[PDB]
Every structure is written in structure tokens, then in C-alpha cells.
């Protein structure tokens, strides 16, 4: 059982990647809502967990954490400062070239769970919600990524939409 992300145009099979990290923004009950960050390229460049590929929202082929997920922020109390999320196990996404890329559902849910755990240990014992992007430009509203000099765009909704206690 898997999650099928649309991607326009069709990413070749050879661009199949490993997801290693994320960037998130914190929105303005014990419910804190996070979105895939729609900030400029500066935040991504300065997360330094981005790694190798030129991607938005997700980081591919990048460096993994040592043991557990580690999250970083330049000010947890300033909503305007992004949170860089670094995983320990990568999430393989295999593109078929039919215009969509596949992710394991169980795998992504466990990833989200661990991220939420680390987020709780930062903001407190609240409810971690993940919602889709906030809009802005088509650049950062979608999971963008560069492969072999081509900049593909994928939809992130199915990844960024769950609730955890």
C-alpha cells in the first residue's frame, strides 16, 4: 500500500530518490499546526540538511541523522523561522515515469509520527497536525526537485495532511 504523488512533467525512472529531511512552518486547544515551508531558497540553503538536490519542502540524497530524528530552528518562538527536520532512515520514492512517484504509506506515517514526537518534545505535549502548503508561488506550493538539470514539480497534499496525539 503506497502514496502516489502527481508530478508534472513525468520524472524519469532514474530520478528515484531517498527523502532524508523536511522543512516546516508553524501556523499562527493543545493543537499546533505545521505546513511544508513555503519560504524562499535562503531557508533551504541555510538548513544545510538539504544535501545535494535542489528541492523544495523535501530533501533528497541528503545526509541522514545519526540515531533519531533531529529538528532544528533559529527561534522556536518566532513563527517566521523555519524548522529543519532531519531523519535517520530515508524514505525511498521511486518514480515510474508515468507522471507520478510512489512512496510507502506505512513508512511515511512512521516518519510523520517520529517528527511529531520530536516536535512535542519541543513545544510540549500538544496535538501535532500537518496540513498542506499555504500557497505563495507555484515554486514552494509544490514539492519541487531538480534532476539532471530539469526542475520537476510534485503535489504534497497527500503527505502533509494528518493528526497525531
Amino acid at each position: 500500500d503506497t502514496i502516489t504523488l502527481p508530478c508534472r512533467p513525468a520524472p524519469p525512472p532514474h530520478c528515484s530518490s531517498n527523502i532524508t529531511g523536511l522543512i516546516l512552518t508553524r501556523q499562527g486547544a493543545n493543537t499546533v499546526i505545521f505546513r511544508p515551508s513555503g519560504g524562499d531558497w535562503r531557508d533551504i540553503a541555510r538548513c544545510q540538511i538539504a544535501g545535494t538536490v535542489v528541492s523544495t519542502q523535501l530533501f533528497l540524497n541528503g545526509s541522514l541523522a545519526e540515531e533519531e530524528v533531529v529538528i532544528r530552528s533559529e527561534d522556536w518562538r518566532d513563527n517566521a523561522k523555519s524548522i529543519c527536520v532531519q531523519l535517520a532512515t530515508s524514505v525511498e520514492i521511486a518514480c515510474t515515469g508515468a507522471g507520478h512517484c510512489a512512496i510507502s504509506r506505512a513508512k511515511w506515517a512512521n516518519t510523520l509520527k517520529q517528527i511529531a514526537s520530536k516536535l512535542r518534545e519541543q513545544y510540549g505535549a500538544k496535538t501535532i497536525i500537518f496540513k498542506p502548503s499555504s500557497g505563495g508561488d507555484p515554486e514552494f506550493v509544490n514539492h519541487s526537485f531538480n534532476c539532471g538539470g530539469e526542475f520537476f514539480y510534485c503535489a504534497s497534499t497527500q503527505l502533509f495532511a494528518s493528526t497525531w496525539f
Epitope: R46, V70, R72, S73, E74, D75, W76, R77, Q122
Partner: antibody, heavy 118, light 109 residues
Framework: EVQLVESGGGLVQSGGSLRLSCAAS????????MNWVRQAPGKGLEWVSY????????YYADSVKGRFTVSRDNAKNSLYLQMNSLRDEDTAVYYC???????????WGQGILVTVSS | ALTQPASVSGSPGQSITISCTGT?????????VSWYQQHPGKAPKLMIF???NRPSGVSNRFSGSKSGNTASLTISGLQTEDEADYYC??????????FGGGTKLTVLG
């Protein structure tokens, strides 16, 4: 176990330069943000400065602004506060605090005394 | 910005509450509210964070609450070890960490 041990302090003259040091151990120093606080003998706590993990977000207090300068070195797991043009009003015990996000400050260093007198 | 009572007293076994008052800035903007204990010549120790939460290891006699413009730290079954200074801390409207005026708890013996 989390441990913050501070170095520096002592007598300084009105207008001198002192650099306080804080060594951290027992946690990824490179992950947490940090803070400097100070307390005048027989007065309360006053947040001095804040330094990000990336050292790109630095914040100062209106008083020390222009005269104090925070820094850090992740290679040595160390935080530093440079105090220049010291006034007698800056005589205090300086503490090394770790940012706890919603907890504000969570771990403190033992504290070191700085006495500015001429 | 945060005002506390200078001094509070109570007997062994009794309970006492320490206030921390403000307005639209600190306790009236976000739930970032912490209480630190300080013994003579030692460093502050986090006793309560996020209004009510208690770091593991701290006795369940310490509790915290907030009522808009007034944070409150309650201590039940006073003992000698409680005798110390206490500070509230918060995050201001304009991203500024602010401490309380400090309050001395004396265990009346």
C-alpha cells in the same frame, strides 16, 4: 548528563574587556539555541543575550546592545560572551542558559562573577 | 514588565501561592511561562514550564496556573528546601525574554 561549566570573570576596569566562556557536554551542542543571563548582587535575573544554533539569529538587550557581543563555536561545543567598555553597572554573576523553546530556559551553568571597578 | 510580590511567608505543612502579573505582552500573548527556583549562591532551577508542566524529578507539590494577566505558582506542604527565591519568565509581544522581579519564599520556622 547535561553539563554547562563557565569560565572567565574576575576584576575588570571601567572600560576594559572580558570574555566569558561556557563549555557544554551531554547533548548535541550544535542543535540547541543558547542564552546569556546576568544577575546583579542582590537583584533579579535579566536576560542578556540570545544566540541561535546557526549563530545567524543573535539578539541583545537594550542596555548591553552595542557593547556586548555573543558568539559560539560548535567545533568546541562552546558559547562565548564578549563584554567591552564595561560599566560598574555591569557587575554581576553571568549565567549560561540553554534555550528550551516553550520551556524558555531549561539548563543553567553554575555562573561566574564579574566585578567592574576602578 | 512582570511584577511579583517581594516576599511571601508560610509555615511548614501549609500552602502558599506566588503571583506574576503583567498585561498584553507576556502572560497575555503566549503560554510561554516558566518558574525558576534559586537557592543562595546557586543557579536557577526550572521548576515549572508552560504554565503548568513540571520537569520530571521535581516534587508534585509545585503547581502552576494562569488566569489571563496573572500567572500563579502554588506550593503545598512547605518544607525548608522550599525556602529560596523564585522567578517567573515569559516571552514578550515583541520577541523579548522577560523575567519577574523575583520573590523570596521564607518557611516560617
Amino acid at each position: 548528563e547535561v553539563q554547562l561549566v563557565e569560565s572567565g570573570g574576575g576584576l575588570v576596569q571601567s572600560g576594559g574587556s572580558l570574555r566569558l566562556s561556557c563549555a557544554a557536554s551531554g547533548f548535541t551542542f550544535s542543535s540547541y539555541n543558547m542564552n546569556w543571563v546576568r544577575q546583579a548582587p542582590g537583584k533579579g535575573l535579566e536576560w542578556v543575550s540570545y544566540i541561535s544554533y546557526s549563530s545567524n539569529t543573535i539578539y541583545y538587550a537594550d542596555s548591553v546592545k552595542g557593547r556586548f557581543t555573543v558568539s559560539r563555536d560548535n567545533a568546541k561545543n562552546s558559547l562565548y560572551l564578549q563584554m567591552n567598555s564595561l560599566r560598574d553597572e555591569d557587575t554581576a554573576v553571568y549565567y549560561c542558559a540553554r534555550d528550551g523553546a516553550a520551556a524558555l530556559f531549561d539548563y543553567w551553568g553554575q555562573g561566574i562573577l564579574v566585578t567592574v571597578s576602578s | 514588565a512582570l511584577t511579583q510580590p517581594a516576599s511571601v511567608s508560610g509555615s511548614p505543612g501549609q500552602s502558599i501561592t506566588i503571583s506574576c502579573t503583567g498585561t498584553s505582552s507576556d502572560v497575555g500573548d503566549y503560554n510561554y511561562v516558566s518558574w525558576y527556583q534559586q537557592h543562595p549562591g546557586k543557579a536557577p532551577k526550572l521548576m515549572i514550564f508552560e504554565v503548568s508542566n513540571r520537569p520530571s524529578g521535581v516534587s508534585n507539590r509545585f503547581s502552576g496556573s494562569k488566569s489571563g494577566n496573572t500567572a500563579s505558582l502554588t506550593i503545598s506542604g512547605l518544607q525548608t528546601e522550599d525556602e529560596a527565591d523564585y522567578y517567573c519568565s515569559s516571552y514578550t509581544s515583541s520577541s523579548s525574554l522577560v523575567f519577574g522581579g523575583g520573590t523570596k519564599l521564607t518557611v516560617l520556622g
